[PDB]
């Protein structure tokens, strides 16, 4: 190895942006399912 | 020809030059350190710690 990277950061996702990203996936799953099942 | 009774499976003459140049190419590496040493230096141990 070498030394520890000084470019370590942390990732954040608040409770607000969770519900956006969940609803984004389910609505795209509702929309595109009917075409994939054909 | 599988069940021929030939030495080390050497079917053709070309495979010998493979064997001789394999043992000797590492033998010559080995003689670069452990060769050309004194063949007349003993010990009363069970194990020798002479040199490199």
């Amino acid at each position: 190895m070498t030394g520890p990277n000084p470019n370590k950061q942390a990732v954040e996702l608040n409770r607000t942006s969770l519900y956006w990203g969940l609803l984004l996936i389910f609505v795209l799953a509702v929309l595109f399912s009917s075409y994939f099942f054909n | 020809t599988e069940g021929t009774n030939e030495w080390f499976g050497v079917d053709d003459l070309r495979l010998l030059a493979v064997l001789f140049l394999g043992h000797w190419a590492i033998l010559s590496l080995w003689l670069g350190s452990y060769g050309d040493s004194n063949e007349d230096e003993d010990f009363f141990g069970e194990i020798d710690y002479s040199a490199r």
């Binding site: 990277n5 470019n7 370590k8 950061q9 942390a10 990732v11 954040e12 996702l13 942006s17 | -």
Partner: protein, 50 residues
């Protein structure tokens, strides 16, 4: 404190890990093209090329 859309900007001031990342995209592109072409040979049928 990075958002999820800035997580890969830790490699801006790090050339040594800029390569290791660019090698990992390469190992996924090359692994795709190998495993796609293995998938296509199980599906291809050379019975009638006409």
């Amino acid at each position: 404190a990075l958002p999820w859309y800035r997580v890969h900007t830790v490699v801006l001031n790090d050339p040594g890990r800029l390569i290791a990342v660019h090698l990992m995209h390469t190992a996924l592109v090359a692994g795709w093209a190998g495993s796609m072409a293995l998938y296509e040979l199980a599906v291809f049928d050379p019975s009638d090329p006409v």
